[PDB]
Ligand binder design. Sequence first.
Ligand SMILES: Nc1ncnc2c1ncn2[C@@H]1O[C@H](CSCC[C@H](N)C(=O)O)[C@@H](O)[C@H]1O
Ligand SMILES: Nc1ncnc2c1ncn2[C@@H]1O[C@H](CSCC[C@H](N)C(=O)O)[C@@H](O)[C@H]1O
Ligand SMILES: Nc1ncnc2c1ncn2[C@@H]1O[C@H](CSCC[C@H](N)C(=O)O)[C@@H](O)[C@H]1O
Ligand SMILES: Nc1ncnc2c1ncn2[C@@H]1O[C@H](CSCC[C@H](N)C(=O)O)[C@@H](O)[C@H]1O
Lengths: 251, 250, 250, 251
Amino acid sequence: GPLLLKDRKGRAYLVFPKEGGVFHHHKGSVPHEALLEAGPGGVVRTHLGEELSVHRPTLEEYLLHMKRSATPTYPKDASAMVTLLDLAPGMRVLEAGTGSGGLTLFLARAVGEKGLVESYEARPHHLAQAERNVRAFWQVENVRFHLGKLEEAELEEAAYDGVALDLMEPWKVLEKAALALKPDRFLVAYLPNITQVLELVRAAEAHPFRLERVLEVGWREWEVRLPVAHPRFQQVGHTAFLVALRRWKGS
Amino acid sequence: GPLLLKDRKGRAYLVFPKEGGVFHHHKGSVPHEALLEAGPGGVVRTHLGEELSVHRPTLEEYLLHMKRSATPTYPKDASAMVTLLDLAPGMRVLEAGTGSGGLTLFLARAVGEKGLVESYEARPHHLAQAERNVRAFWQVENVRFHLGKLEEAELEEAAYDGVALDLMEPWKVLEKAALALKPDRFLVAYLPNITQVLELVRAAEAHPFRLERVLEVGWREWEVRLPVAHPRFQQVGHTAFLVALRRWKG
Amino acid sequence: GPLLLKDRKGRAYLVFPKEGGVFHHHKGSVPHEALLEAGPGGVVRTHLGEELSVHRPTLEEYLLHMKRSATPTYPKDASAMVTLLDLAPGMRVLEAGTGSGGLTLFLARAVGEKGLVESYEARPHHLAQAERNVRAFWQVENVRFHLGKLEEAELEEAAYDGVALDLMEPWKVLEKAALALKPDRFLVAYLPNITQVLELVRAAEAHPFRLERVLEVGWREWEVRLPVAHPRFQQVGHTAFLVALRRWKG
Amino acid sequence: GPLLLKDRKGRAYLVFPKEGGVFHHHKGSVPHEALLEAGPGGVVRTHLGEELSVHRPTLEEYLLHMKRSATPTYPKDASAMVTLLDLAPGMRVLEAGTGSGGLTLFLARAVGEKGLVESYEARPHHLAQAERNVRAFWQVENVRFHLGKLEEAELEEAAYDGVALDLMEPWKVLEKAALALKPDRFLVAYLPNITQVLELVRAAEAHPFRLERVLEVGWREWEVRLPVAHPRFQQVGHTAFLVALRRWKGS
Ligand SMILES: Nc1ncnc2c1ncn2[C@@H]1O[C@H](CSCC[C@H](N)C(=O)O)[C@@H](O)[C@H]1O
Ligand SMILES: Nc1ncnc2c1ncn2[C@@H]1O[C@H](CSCC[C@H](N)C(=O)O)[C@@H](O)[C@H]1O
Ligand SMILES: Nc1ncnc2c1ncn2[C@@H]1O[C@H](CSCC[C@H](N)C(=O)O)[C@@H](O)[C@H]1O
Ligand SMILES: Nc1ncnc2c1ncn2[C@@H]1O[C@H](CSCC[C@H](N)C(=O)O)[C@@H](O)[C@H]1O
């Protein structure tokens, strides 16, 4: 399990500890052993008043700092997608594209060791990084990764409890998703542009799906250091829209 | 388990099906047998002409429609709280107050059958309803309910992976929460008023927590039925602030 | 001019005082003479026990309560539109459609007695009500009303300092607006649907405008009555998008 | 009247043209005469595909680019304050502190040549810059500037149609503002911190004012370059709260 270090300026660093390893930093390098000794919740004092706080990274912190090729789903959105997909332990969820494994991790927590994340990724380098990212943080073998286009997947009809999409052209996978998804259950797509949203809404009218939700998730952060207290001057204003479709009654 | 009925104007109704049972609304009645026979995503019509779609409710739907003692945590907030608490399967999470069991259900899904929700509620009538709400929707025996004030709980030290609070005066449970919480893990409190937030922040100065987050969750719904496409004219403007405090190692 | 009455639950009522006139509400009646005698910020009580405060309405208050043909531009948006149009005293601004005269009033204040609002309205019943609404609140003769479609207006070239639009199909008036608007000045359109916004943007590709802004205005109200202090549970979620196009010099 | 130049990268520059003046820029310097010749709405082509678009700056553009000491009120907020103050031509509005003259300009447009902005500023260097900023953009002599604390001002009772505040400790000027402001008219204060808001709300309970509004103005910008269309990824999340008080009935 990696560590997250924060310095006094609030800069964050993801460290994968190894014996003989050294964390380099402008106010003093620290052997990895010192980090492990301090442990999550602890500190390592260095030079000129500097102090590195040591943390077990939350899944949010991990997504935000992990290596990536494809930009991962933002934590606020991945969190909402799991709820909109109504995922509970033991469920089977279809995902494309794996990307960098950010959403994959959220999905994998939600369905747990008896559940399944069936994840597809078309690009081999993307998939390799995603697999590293997932495995470095999560040891439960409840993700089945597939190299290939979701359009071409061999899937059991009505075997999946939800379908999570994060890809540029979700209309292309709606036929496969409609086949996979249990009646009355949900597909939820993440899309940056309202034009993409409208295109998906129109495309879904050619499939057994009913539009249920189009929403924007906002996590409006405050800066509070009493007596200072105000919404942060600079916010992430937008990441993507979430589009939820419900699968038509069966047969 | 429960069924959810949806009408044409979006409105939803929770039904607990029984033999010879009848769902009664202003727009007519439907026998419970008809609902059971309808299947997932099926439709029924009352004699008065009301068309109703039949569903197994999502957790979000259930929270919003289940019988309430205290108002439950809204789904957008319970969702964010689970993420801010960083709950993974097998974890042990402390909660107060159980209330109506809404947040309890989110916490219980997050930690799974190998984890534990340790949930406290001061008011017996509230706890009884919460236990009913939880058991009607969730069959996994991973919730341990406790009658009493969290301030008066007998808790194991550094035994909990998170502390979830939804109560009026969280400053009063800070000592107990700090005792229970493992180093580097979170207390996350749900608070409607910014004054409560500021009081919690000030009180937390006397306890082994760093303030990490104060945030507002918004789920801004759009209406899209082309040509129509805009954020909904009416939204939930505010429910509560979320405050995240991270326990340090002494 | 008009008076505004406010009750205890925040609700407001516009009254036009006349000799022997009586304001009638569900919670009783007040003679118009009593309202006139009350003074600014004074209170009256109906026989039924309703307490009402007496005010000269603000423009914001007037817009929200005046008799309507078409729904007027909301105050938060009319306010932003005046700024995006960059209206200063003495300027000449083109408007369509007059509607109920809400935006007309904002525009007329901005340009002042030395400026001009040139306002077009296709529907005679709408224009008649708008003229009434404007004249009841504003005595400055700086508004020239015109019955007709803006697309069919006879306009002087490069004679206008801004073009304010609140109508369903602004793409249809782009040719006329481009003719009328001085170089470097703005057309600002109020549009409820994002689809309208995208259609306007696409249509504007064939006219001498650069797209400068597409924005949503929000005025997020708080309730503050200590201990209570939070954004209001219920807000206006959306009214319209504002689109600003800047005329270039050919 | 100054010009605002924009280059192809979207960088904006405020230029006060003068004969013999030269605008310096990495892809080619341009004599001020060329700028004036192009005029608002025109362009000056320079090197390597660069093009400077020439503009008459809007008041919004001016506030955002003008020299400052004190940070001016943001345009979205100044716009809202004028509406909340219900300012119409001919009115008399009290202001403190002048700062850099941003809000002053909004107030001066609203009340017009027959109106009055009575503006107070305690700090001489601030006032000097504010006066330059106002005079460079606005030639109407409807602003009376005062060097000094508003607390110490000689004011006519019930002579002002509105009171606009942008200063750190508005509670200190409430006695003077209550004296100045006509019954049933408004004071509106701009405050960054919710703690300041609460302090003002409590302080106003010692004066003949009724709390009417506490609000946050948001102008949520979109990026639209078809087929791209989404709320901007990065927004100004917060500037300040606006607090509106209504003056009690007279006598
Ligand atoms: N039809 C398709 N089938 C499988 N993968 C696809 C696909 N279309 C796009 N992709 C892949 O989908 C990914 C989108 S980025 C996904 C990011 C991911 N949610 C995360 O959190 O890390 C890219 O890696 C792209 O290669
Ligand atoms: N100190 C305390 N210890 C235990 N319960 C408390 C408490 N203070 C308040 N409560 C209880 O906390 C509850 C707050 S309402 C909680 C709602 C809950 N999150 C849900 O989703 O259903 C009330 O039922 C109240 O009785
Ligand atoms: N092409 C056109 N020319 C003139 N008026 C038009 C028009 N298209 C629509 N309209 C008019 O535009 C109005 C839109 S409602 C405008 C409301 C107005 N801004 C207010 O604040 O009161 C309607 O009255 C409609 O009849
Ligand atoms: N009591 C007081 N009387 C006069 N000026 C005051 C004051 N308290 C603070 N100030 C001044 O108020 C200013 C606040 S910054 C004001 C910015 C201004 N709204 C603008 O748009 O440019 C500072 O210049 C400060 O010196």
